[PDB]
Design a protein around this ligand. Structure first.
Ligand SMILES: Nc1nc2c(ncn2[C@@H]2O[C@H](COP(=O)(O)OP(=O)(O)O)[C@@H](O)[C@H]2O)c(=O)[nH]1
Ligand SMILES: Nc1nc2c(ncn2[C@@H]2O[C@H](COP(=O)(O)OP(=O)(O)O)[C@@H](O)[C@H]2O)c(=O)[nH]1
Ligand code: ALF
Ligand code: ALF
Ligand SMILES: [Mg+2]
Ligand SMILES: [Mg+2]
Lengths: 271, 293
RNA sequence: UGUUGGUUCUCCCGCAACGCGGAAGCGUGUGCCGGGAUGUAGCUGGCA
């Protein structure tokens, strides 16, 4: 049965779940399998799924944007993970549920960021509030939020510039963006969404940690699950921070965003 | 963590006799754990471990002072060996224009890297550089390159999303030959190894311009999946080099080993920031010490 | 258009933070939406 210890250990590790989380899940699995005296494979697969299901059941809360004017979502995370693409997706979704959406082009740093967002705005036939690269991000987003109140907009999604979490000064910048929002709405940002590239390994932990400490994360989006990457690191992060997983990215077209469903995620992870 | 763990295993199993395979057991498992938390893809960890085993059998160890330190010296030496050599360069001495093709997954840092290479090549190798984008997929990608190009004082060959990448690069090469340019940098859209049509596309682009360099660009925070991508890309194109981007982050960077192993190709550059000046040469020992902490 | 609040660029300065550097110092997608000068200037928001 040692070849089985070796085998499942390998399966967990190749999916980027991490060693600590691997020990937790496997240790609980030895106790569960020995306990219920399981003799067949399919039942083992079942129990594994059940326990992982426990971890993900604390983070399955879907996002609700109803009830505020506007409901403010703040997109944060590291570079090139797909924050902007995800916003593009989010808009078509919200427009599908009869919500008027506005976009803030808060990435005022990276080359062509604003034009990129604007393409998502034209694709969504919704307004995009922007100044230029070089502008103050915080003030761009603030102006956006004021404009959304004025125009009775239902959801305002603010893009930020991707930043690495060890760059403390960029995190301070992030904090200003939030702080400055508070002057219009104390409970905004109503959703602070971390975006994690599914290719990412254990550094995601650090990411989730530092952004959290900076800003208080209220949701996660897992992108690029349309490849071979399973994105298992999320278990570790769920274990440590309990952040709701809102959506999954599954491609680059405007329709390639799916509400996060734990069971589908389990399905994908194994095949 | 490293020195102290290795010192623990080495004082506790063996006393003061030479190191023999039965002393090595705990050492090997723990090194494996360290490398896994460092995001080194598993198979690569096994293969490195075996070499470590081989260096462990005939150890000349009982003589140095700290057992952890000598064993560490050997792991470090092995790793620095694995990583390659210094002063690894782009072939700019052959017939001009030197065509450089970028390849890799979405958001890896390819466009940013093209800008960085434009800066490096014009400023330091006194090169006359043309850059082009074949990214007709990601919105505003071309304008992103055009911007970067205008910023680094290099010429930009216009393309639009209504064109086809093969047409674009053929045109670009034609212009570079015709106007006696020293270098053609070719930016492409991020693509997944499972994307059959896009891999066909990159294979065809490479076939069209016969590039002297094909650079595989890889996000340094990449976890296990790097084993897959590397393999696919290595098998899809003749890679001549690797760019590892976002090393200015705090990720341990183990993907570098993984990739380096599976492709056997040299890492030529580190991307070390978002700005165009942020480019560094690859030093095996520095990255090695980073991965081991 | 009318009025105000942002911001950018140009000039001026303060406090602090971060990065690099024996240090002196050089910086700044950092903070105090710091303080001023200025444009006939831009870009952005609110309200009549
Ligand atoms: N294959 C795939 N690509 C994605 C996904 N999400 C984003 N991308 C691509 O990732 C690249 C970078 O994403 P972007 O939104 O510009 O990153 P940002 O810097 O975080 O805003 C873009 O080329 C996107 O098309 C996804 O779910 N699957
Ligand atoms: N911090 C950091 N960011 C980088 C680096 N290289 C690229 N990026 C960022 O990653 C994001 C995606 O870059 P991009 O060049 O468009 O990726 P591409 O889709 O492969 O062209 C942008 O925010 C870049 O600024 C790097 O070395 N360090
Ligand atoms: F390219 Al980014 F946030 F990393 F727009
Ligand atoms: F988003 Al890319 F190359 F992956 F521009
Ligand atoms: Mg973006
Ligand atoms: Mg690009």
């Amino acid at each position: 049965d040692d070849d089985l210890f070796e085998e499942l250990e390998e399966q967990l590790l190749i999916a980027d779940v991490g060693v600590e989380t691997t020990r937790k899940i496997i240790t609980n699995l030895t106790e569960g399998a020995s306990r219920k005296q399981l003799r067949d494979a399919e039942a083992l697969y079942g129990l594994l799924k059940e326990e992982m299901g426990e971890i993900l059941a604390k983070v399955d809360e879907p996002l609700n944007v109803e009830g505020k004017a506007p409901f403010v979502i703040l997109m944060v995370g590291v570079n090139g993970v797909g924050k902007t693409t995800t916003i593009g997706k989010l808009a078509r979704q919200f427009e599908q549920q009869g919500k008027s959406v506005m976009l803030a082009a808060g990435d005022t740093f990276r080359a062509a960021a604003v034009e990129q967002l604007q393409v998502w705005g034209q694709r969504n036939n919704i307004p995009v509030i922007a100044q230029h690269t070089g502008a103050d991000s915080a003030s761009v987003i603030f102006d956006a939020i004021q404009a959304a109140k004025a125009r009775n907009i239902d959801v305002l999604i603010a893009d930020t510039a991707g930043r690495l979490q060890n760059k403390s000064h960029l995190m301070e910048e992030l904090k200003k963006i939030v702080r400055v929002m508070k002057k219009l709405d104390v409970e905004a940002p109503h959703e602070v969404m971390l975006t994690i590239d599914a290719s990412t390994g254990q550094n995601a932990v650090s990411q989730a940690k530092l952004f959290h400490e900076a800003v208080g994360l209220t949701g996660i989006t897992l992108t690029k699950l349309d490849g071979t990457a399973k994105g298992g690191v999320i278990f570790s992060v769920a274990d440590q921070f309990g952040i709701p997983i809102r959506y999954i990215g599954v491609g680059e077209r405007i329709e390639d965003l799916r509400p996060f469903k734990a069971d589908d995620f389990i399905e994908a992870l194994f095949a | 963590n490293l020195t102290d763990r290795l010192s623990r295993t080495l004082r506790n199993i063996s006393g003061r006799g030479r190191l023999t395979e039965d002393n090595v057991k705990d050492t090997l498992r723990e090194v494996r754990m360290a490398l896994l938390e460092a995001d080194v893809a598993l198979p690569v960890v096994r293969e490195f471990i075996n070499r470590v085993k081989e260096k462990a059998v005939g150890h000349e160890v009982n003589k140095s002072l700290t057992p952890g330190q000598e064993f560490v010296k050997i792991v470090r030496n092995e790793l620095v060996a694995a990583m390659g050599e210094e002063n690894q360069t782009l072939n700019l001495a052959a017939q001009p224009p030197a065509v450089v093709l970028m390849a890799g997954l979405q958001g890896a840092g390819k466009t940013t890297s093209v800008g960085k290479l434009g800066k490096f090549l014009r400023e330091k190798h006194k090169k006359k550089v043309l850059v082009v984008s074949a990214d007709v997929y990601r919105p505003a990608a071309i304008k992103q390159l055009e911007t970067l190009a205008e910023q680094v004082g290099v010429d930009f060959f216009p393309s639009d999303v209504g064109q086809k990448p093969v047409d674009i690069v053929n045109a670009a090469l034609k212009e570079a030959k015709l106007k006696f340019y020293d270098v053609l940098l070719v930016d492409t859209a991020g693509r997944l190894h499972v994307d059959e049509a896009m891999m066909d596309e990159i294979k065809q682009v490479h076939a069209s311009i016969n590039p002297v360099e094909t650079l595989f660009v890889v996000d340094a925070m990449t976890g296990q999946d790097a084993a897959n991508t590397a393999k696919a890309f290595n098998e899809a194109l003749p890679l001549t080099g690797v760019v590892l981007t976002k090393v200015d982050g705090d990720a341990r960077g183990g993907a570098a080993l993984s990739i380096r192993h599976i492709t056997g190709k040299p890492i030529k550059f580190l991307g070390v920031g978002e700005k165009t000046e942020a480019l560094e040469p690859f030093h095996p020992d520095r990255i090695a010490s980073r991965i081991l902490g």
